[PDB]
Design a protein that fits this description.
2 copies of one chain form a homodimer. By secondary structure, the first copy, chain A, is mostly helical. Chain A has one domain: Orthogonal Bundle (Recoverin, domain 1). The first copy, chain A, is built from 4 helices and 2 strands. Chain A has a two-stranded antiparallel sheet. Chain A is globular and about 50 Å long. Bound molecules: calcium ion (4 copies). It is classed as metal binding protein. Keywords: oligomerisation, neuronal development, spine2. The assembly is dimeric.
């Protein structure tokens, strides 16, 4: 199914970056930065934005273990997907006026 | 990017079922049923299970407007993906 394909992909993406160092199933700041730069580059306007990454790391690491675990990563993905969905919807609503 | 491809897919799937009736951007119980049966059938052990769909509807519709909006739908997707990831990680741990 298209949905479970997407779910599989969320899992794969995470594990593509989380296994370079430290906990194999959590993202370090470095691994997160890597993932942001390669996977969400449009959100960084294809710029390097370390201070922004720092803030993303701080907002996502809710339990303060200096890692972004999978639950924490999914919080990111959910927020950015909702925001994009909302964008597309408002663009259609604006058009129908 | 693989990630943004997946995010796009989440949006497209929801909008694939949400536009049959009512709000074009929310799932009725009926629309949610169609989505669950087409997209998550393995979670239903490939059975039709309207009693479980009812409970799923009731759980996802946190604002009690009788619809599952996109945010509500992503709560389900997050929960299921997290559970699936946990499964795959515990299967690896077990193996070692
Ligand atoms: Ca790691
Ligand atoms: Ca954390
Ligand atoms: Ca609808
Ligand atoms: Ca609702």
């Amino acid at each position: 199914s298209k949905l479970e394909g997407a779910m599989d992909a969320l899992i794969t993406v995470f594990h593509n970056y989380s296994g370079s160092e430290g906990d194999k199933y959590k993202l370090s700041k470095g691994e997160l930065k890597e993932l942001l730069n390669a996977e969400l580059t449009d959100f960084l306007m294809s710029q390097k934005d370390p201070m922004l990454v720092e803030k993303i790391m701080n907002d996502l690491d809710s339990n303060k273990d200096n890692e972004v675990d999978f639950n924490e990563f999914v919080v990111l993905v959910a927020a950015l997907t909702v925001a994009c969905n909302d964008f597309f919807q408002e663009q259609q609503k604006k058009r129908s006026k």
